[PDB]
Amino acid sequence: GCLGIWKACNPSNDQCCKSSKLVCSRKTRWCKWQI
Numbered sequence: 001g002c003l004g005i006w007k008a009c010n011p012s013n014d015q016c017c018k019s020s021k022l023v024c025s026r027k028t029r030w031c032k033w034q035i
Contacts, residue, residue, distance in 0.1 A: 005031045 002017030003009050009016050009024035009031055016022040022031040 003031055005033065007031055 002019055002022070003015065003024075004017075005022060007016075008029050011024065011026035011029055014024040014026070016024045016031040020033065022033045024030075025032050
């Protein structure tokens with residue numbers, strides 16, 4: 001499943017929403033797409 005944009009992802013386990021192309025930010029723990 002996905003994770004929302006401002007949601008807490010895993011810095012050392014990038015997953016997030018691969019479907020919507022959001023990648024986890026490591027230093028910031030949120031998901032980011034274009035930002």
